Amino acid sequence: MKYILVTGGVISGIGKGIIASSIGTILKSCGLRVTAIKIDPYINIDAGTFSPYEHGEVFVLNDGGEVQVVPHITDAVQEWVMNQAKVPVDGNKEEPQICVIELGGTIGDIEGMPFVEAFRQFQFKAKRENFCNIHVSLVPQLSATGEQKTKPTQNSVRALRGLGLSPDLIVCRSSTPIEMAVKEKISMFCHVNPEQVICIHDVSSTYRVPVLLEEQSIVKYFKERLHLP
Amino acid sequence: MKYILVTGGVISGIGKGIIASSIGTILKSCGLRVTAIKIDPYINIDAGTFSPYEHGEVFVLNDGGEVQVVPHITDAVQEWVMNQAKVPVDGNKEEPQICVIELGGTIGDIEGMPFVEAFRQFQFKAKRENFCNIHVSLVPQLSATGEQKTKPTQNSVRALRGLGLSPDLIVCRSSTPIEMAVKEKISMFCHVNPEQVICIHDVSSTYRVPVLLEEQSIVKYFKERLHLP
Amino acid sequence: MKYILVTGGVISGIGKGIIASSIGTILKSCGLRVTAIKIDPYININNITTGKIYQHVINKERRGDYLGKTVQVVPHITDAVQEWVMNQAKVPVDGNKEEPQICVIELGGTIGDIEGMPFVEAFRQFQFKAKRENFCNIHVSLVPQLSATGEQKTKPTQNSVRALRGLGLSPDLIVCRSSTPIEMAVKEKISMFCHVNPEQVICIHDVSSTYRVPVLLEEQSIVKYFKERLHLP
Amino acid sequence: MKYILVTGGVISGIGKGIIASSIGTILKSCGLRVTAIKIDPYININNITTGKIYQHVINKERRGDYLGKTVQVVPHITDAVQEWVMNQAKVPVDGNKEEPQICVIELGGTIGDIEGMPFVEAFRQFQFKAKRENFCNIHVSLVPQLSATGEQKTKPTQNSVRALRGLGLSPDLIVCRSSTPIEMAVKEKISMFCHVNPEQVICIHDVSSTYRVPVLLEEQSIVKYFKERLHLP
Ligand SMILES: Nc1ncnc2c1ncn2[C@@H]1O[C@H](COP(=O)(O)OP(=O)(O)O)[C@@H](O)[C@H]1O
Ligand SMILES: Nc1ncnc2c1ncn2[C@@H]1O[C@H](COP(=O)(O)OP(=O)(O)O)[C@@H](O)[C@H]1O
Ligand SMILES: Nc1ncnc2c1ncn2[C@@H]1O[C@H](COP(=O)(O)OP(=O)(O)O)[C@@H](O)[C@H]1O
Ligand SMILES: Nc1ncnc2c1ncn2[C@@H]1O[C@H](COP(=O)(O)OP(=O)(O)O)[C@@H](O)[C@H]1O
């Protein structure tokens, strides 16, 4: 089993699903058996025991936006990912070759930490030749100046590295297309090679996203990086 | 209703309970009606939805160390604190005058954040003449050197201020007693007056703790600070 | 002297200068003697820079002003910054012979960056020396928005405000900068998730002329705020 | 050149010097040419200081080396730090005429303090220039213990390790310093809550003579570790 983990930076609604979706379609296009899974961290659940001087303890919980109960979430994530990845999908009746994992929330979210920890551990179980990750981050731009900015993505990538994952591709999302100078800064200040910086701007129909990925040699990259046929 | 909130710094098992307990006893000694309440944040509950490609969503939870369910924990904390504080205690049949609130966990704990937020908001509802807080922090000391350190407490106090509470007294806990130079540094680098730094070292029976507080003029302080009889 | 400190978040080119400038313009039109100090965190040598302040303290140390003692960023640089601000803020301006009543300090850089920390630390400490009613700070931060969705996002400002708080300053006003006007749902979300009242969230969108910035600031009662917060005549 | 960076956490006087020194002593006894660089974050002027490095770059700027450009802490100070480390690390020592194989860099200060950040940032970047097998970093941190309870606590080391990670370095060894020996329950808790294998948690308690420190380090297989981690002969 090969795995591609997709995470998000700086903001939510950054395009995690579309990137995972698109990577799925691209590889199926080359005749690979590909499965998708999503892990969505739940809006944090805040609890506590309240204790009056001389009367019973009330235990207060907190509604989220609204079922298995495990001892260790971290072990449960890695067991459930490994097992679902095997479940045959589409037709094809056989074990998938690539599993595209979609991690909801944004890197830096308090609620995401246990799941990022899960995958930090997992990358060493999977071994490097069968596991890579892709960080989808924002490059903002105010209309008043036109200047696209790399700082938010710089910081996001550092947060990600801090939590133990090194991004194999950085997907830079932006309103208008990214100019070579800014693409050069991302490469240089996030310490990845130029080819690992993929730029996907806002497009008028989703179909264009896979096309842009392919135009930026994503398949050649995944081929070397995961040893794919 | 007057309120004294007790929080902890740098480490757990810092002596929050003993300080709250001792403050309770001291004020009762002056004939005040005093009640105690404890809020203990629960070991964080990590959840998430897992989603296979073409099969039902499993929702995974996480055991803590093991009941009311509210929309906003922050509002629930402040309502429950205000109401319990009124409940007559000991004999005395009448509404307590002072409520000593004990906040479990340590400032900086992810799980403590909503409750510290609760009290940030609460200090403005209670108004300043009826609300103060007391931060019980560690001053460590290695046997190899003997040198007591203020940095952990400096940082703890900054974290506390960052979350919106300014400590009215800093209670410095340590293995051996604190020397004047270190007591001077705490005062100066945590930006409180000398009299707001109270030092309570490790003692051989709990009874000594209230005595040390009184020796360091805690009652004179609470008198001016809360307008007590 | 009363002091207003303008810092920026998330990105450079966020509008620190225009805000610093507009607050100045607004306050002068209510009859107040306003002065301006600019801090540039760069090393090149009423305007202070890392170069100038470090060269000053290095030179002092080098000729023995500190009597052999160990000289450190905190407190020696940070003392020099505070001593430098207080002395500049007193210098008469705009033709007046009397001491300025207010000093708007513009701190270049973006909060979170290493170059700016000596200055943020200087001001963390300075707010305790000044009374509360003689110092406040304003944080100018990005509310970004992809055209694909049109959703304004508050997370970057949340993380920026939390980092500022981390470094010891708590913003009295959060000026949210966006391409298009911030709507009330998003404006309340900033109030909620940063930890401030609604009236402390000031929204300043991209305008077609910068004279509109002080118009927008006055429209959101910034003078009422500063009167109460700094006790101004 | 291979580099080992020693940093400290929670408190000063935590043992950075003894660890830096003991690693050096241990590695020399396995036949390796070891050199030492000390960084002092103070401003006073193979030993570098904030004063020296800032004075150097200020002077360069002042005479026009950077051709009018804006000079900044990052990259100009941080470049100078990295250029300075590489050049010192090459200089022959201990009587040998050949280039040293390993350089132990001792960074004074405590992680989290402003004075140390230019240096931590220099090394965050430097670890990408060097190969992975030519750079690792060791973090010396406090496991405190009140006599009242006798409970060793890991939270301070957790927060310290997370702050180091925040500044862009991830410790390859956490050296936990305590008054009395750390027991296995607490040793596993550090492995768990910081995010590292058990063999990366090295415990060094207060001893009655500092020669015991390298004895304890070798007892916990630090050489085995460095052989694998830095690919050493
Ligand atoms: N490159 C793009 N161009 C235009 N719209 C996009 C692009 N990428 C994503 N979107 C749209 O933006 C929204 C957010 O995308 P989604 O994949 O759901 O993000 P996330 O998975 O991070 O929530 C969706 O409506 C999606 O169709
Ligand atoms: N000053 C002191 N001297 C000796 N023992 C103390 C002192 N303060 C607290 N203790 C003891 O240390 C332990 C922790 O105290 P506790 O109040 O339960 O801390 P917390 O409320 O922060 O958990 C208890 O066993 C308590 O009796
Ligand atoms: N609200 C706004 N609308 C349009 N343009 C703006 C606005 N605020 C700032 N600008 C412009 O953006 C650029 C950057 O502003 P500036 O104040 O120089 O930012 P900073 O001081 O943060 O670097 C300038 O051209 C400025 O006139
Ligand atoms: N494991 C230890 N046992 C006893 N004393 C120690 C130990 N480690 C360091 N020390 C002593 O503690 C003091 C501080 O050590 P040092 O290495 O100078 O700390 P730093 O370099 O972090 O300032 C010195 O007197 C040193 O000999």
Amino acid at A180: M
Domains of chain A as residue ranges with CATH: 1-229 (3.40.50.300)
Find residues 11-70 of chain A whose CB sits inside 8 Å of chain C.
Answer: 11-15
Ligand 1 near A16 CB (within 6 A): yes
Interface test with C, best of A16, A110, A151 (most C CBs within 10 A): A151
Contacts of A65 (CB under 8 A, 6+ apart): A43
Quote the DSSP letter at residue D210: T
Nearest to A117 by CA among A170, A69, A165, A154: A165
Ligand 4 atom nearest to CA at D140: 22
3-state secondary structure of B141: strand
Whether C156 and A10 lie within 8 Å, measured CB to CB: yes
| CA A171 to ligand 3 center in whole angstroms | 28
Q: What Cα–Cα distance (Å) separates residue B78 from each residue in A91, B3, B72? A: 56, 12, 10
Question: Are A139 and A9 spatial neighbours (Cβ–Cβ below 8 Å)?
Answer: no
Distance CA C220, CA B215 (A): 52
3-state secondary structure of C197: coil
Whether D61 and C51 lie within 8 Å, measured CB to CB: yes
CA distance B162 to chain C (A): 5
Nearest to B17 by CA among B150, B25, D186: B25
By C-alpha distance, the chain D residue nearest A192 is: D128
Q: Provide the token pair at A165.
A: 């994952």
The residue nearest atom 14 of ligand 3, judged by CA position, is C13
CA distance A195 to chain D (A): 17
Quick one: which H or E segment has residue D126?
A: helix D117-129
D68, burial (CB in 10 Å: exposed 0-12, middle 13-18, buried 19+): exposed
Distance CA C67, CA B45 (A): 56
CA distance C55 to chain D (A): 7
3-state secondary structure of C141: strand
Quick one: which H or E segment has residue D105?
A: strand D102-107
Distance CA A74, CA B47 (A): 11
Among the partner residues C128, C168, C195, nearest to B164 by beta-carbon distance = C195
Buried-exposed string C193-204: b where 16+ CB fall within 10 A, e elsewhere: ebbbeeebbbbb
| CA D153 to ligand 2 center in whole angstroms | 14
Distance CA B148, CA B173 (A): 11
φ/ψ (deg, to 5) at B124: -85, -25
The full 3-state SS of chain A, as one line of letters, equals CEEEEEEECCCCCCCHHHHHHHHHHHHHHCCCCEEEEEEEECCCECCEEEECCCCCCEEEEECCCCCEEECCHHHHHHHHHHHHHHCCCCCCCCCCCEEEEEECCCCCCHHHHHHHHHHHHHHHHHCHHHEEEEEEEECCECCCCCCECCHHHHHHHHHHHHCCCCCCEEEEEECCCCCHHHHHHHHHHCCCCHHHEEEEECCCCCCHHHHHHHHCCHHHHHHHHHCCC
Question: Are C34 and C24 spatial neighbours (Cβ–Cβ below 8 Å)?
Answer: yes
Interface test with C, best of D54, D110, D114 (most C CBs within 10 A): D114
Cis upstream peptide for A177 (omega within 30°): no
Q: Which ligand lies nearest to the CA atom of residue B107 in the structure?
A: 2
C33, burial (CB in 10 Å: exposed 0-12, middle 13-18, buried 19+): middle
For residue B143, the chain D residues in CB contact (below 8 A) are 179-180, 206
Greatest pairwise CA separation for chain D in angstroms: 63
Q: Write down the experimental method used for this entry.
A: X-ray
Distance CA B206, CA C161 (A): 42
Resolution (A): 2.8
Whether B138 and D144 lie within 8 Å, measured CB to CB: yes
CA distance D10 to chain B (A): 6
Nearest to D221 by CA among D189, D206, D199: D199
Q: What Cα–Cα distance (Å) separates residue D38 from each residue in D77, D106, D125? A: 17, 5, 19
Q: Given the DSSP bridges, would you call strands B48-51 and A98-103 parallel, antiparallel or unpaired?
A: unpaired
Buried-exposed string C114-138: b where 16+ CB fall within 10 A, e elsewhere: bbbbbbbbbbbbbbeebeeeebbbb
CA distance D44 to chain A (A): 31
Contacts of D171 (CB under 8 A, 6+ apart): D7, D137, D138, D139, D161, D164, D194, D196, D200
Distance CA A43, CA B114 (A): 13
- Tokens 């010192």 locate to D88
| CA C18 to ligand 3 center in whole angstroms | 6
| Half-sphere exposure at residue A109, Cβ-oriented, CA atoms within 13 angstroms | 23
Distance CA D156, CA D173 (A): 16
Ligand 1 near C149 CB (within 6 A): yes
Distance CA D48, CA A37 (A): 51
Angle B197-B169-C2 from CA coordinates, rounded to 5°: 95
Q: Which ligand lies nearest to the CA atom of residue B8 in the structure?
A: 2
Ligand 1 near A34 CB (within 6 A): no
Whether C166 and B164 lie within 8 Å, measured CB to CB: no
| CA A133 to ligand 4 center in whole angstroms | 42
Ligand 2 near B13 CB (within 6 A): yes
Whether D128 and A191 lie within 8 Å, measured CB to CB: yes
Nearest to C52 by CA among C31, C32, C35, C37: C37
Q: What is the CA radius of gyration of chain D?
A: 18
Angle A49-B109-D8 from CA coordinates, rounded to 5°: 155
Nearest to A74 by CA among C37, B46, B147: B46
Axis-axis angle for helices A113-126, A73-86 (nearest 10): 50
Question: Are D24 and D101 spatial neighbours (Cβ–Cβ below 8 Å)?
Answer: no
**C181 at A interface, C-beta within 8 A:** no
φ/ψ (deg, to 5) at A17: -60, -50
Cross-strand pairs, D7? D139
Q: What Cα–Cα distance (Å) separates residue A158 from each residue in A178, C103, D124? A: 21, 36, 10
